[PDB]
């Protein structure tokens with residue numbers, strides 16, 4: 433079926449939970465043996481969210497190459513994304529090592545450091561220009577260059593230096609700051625505006641390594657971001673845009689990381705975002 437009318441048909445019939453459970457039943461199951469080794473317990477935020485072995489990002493290190501991060505490679509859309517958990521106190525250096533090694537331009541953050549009165553990820557970037565951060569375990573230096581605070585999101589320019597080689601690179605930090613503590617946003621308008629700002633920066637383009645996107649577990653809000661982006665790109669590429677099937681795209685993405693889209697409300701919000709976004713594109 434088309435999307436907008438499939439949408440109203442699920443609303444009128446109140447069957448979002450049944451649709452979402454079907455997705456959960458059909459989703460791929462691949463091994464994640466490296467994630468579960470005992471030496472990696474303090475590298476995982478949640479025991480039930482792990483990267484598959486076949487698609488995990490490897491750190492360029494011989495001691496321990498493990499990080500909780502996955503490469504989502506979308507062949508028809510010609511887009512790639514790295515989806516990862518919010519960094520932990522003992523993985524902030526690994527996080528920036530990955531950004532460096534994978535040649536990423538942009539980092540997309542969809543959570544606040546504290547939500548619901550608890551810490552959802554480490555404070556992993558500097559907040560003042562004159563107070564830079566040094567990650568001694570991976571030999572990197574990170575400096576805040578500029579910050580632009582808007583009503584729904586903040587964009588930061590950061591400098592990442594590899595202290596071994598003295599090479600430097602400019603990284604863009606795109607921080608969506610207004611996702612509610614509970615539920616999903618009422619309108620997709622600010623989320624779509626944010627997606628378009630990431631696109632306009634070059635961070636999603638083939639001349640750079642894959643964008644790094646995270647929330648707390650790296651599957652819920654993060655899944656909504658890449659699902660909406662890929663569906664809108666396919667609607668631009670194909671002769672028949674009504675052929676784009678958001679459930680099929682989501683199942684393809686779940687071949688590369690488990691659990692993408694965590695609730696039926698997130699599924700409905702993803703439909704809403706693609707529907708409204710397709711009208712603005714034209």
Ligand SMILES: Cc1cc(=O)oc2c(CN(C)C)c(O)ccc12
Pocket residue numbers: 491492493494
């Ligand atoms: C992919 C890759 C390229 C590279 O330059 O080096 C690697 C190393 C070691 N060097 C010193 C970083 C690894 O241990 C693991 C992977 C790589």
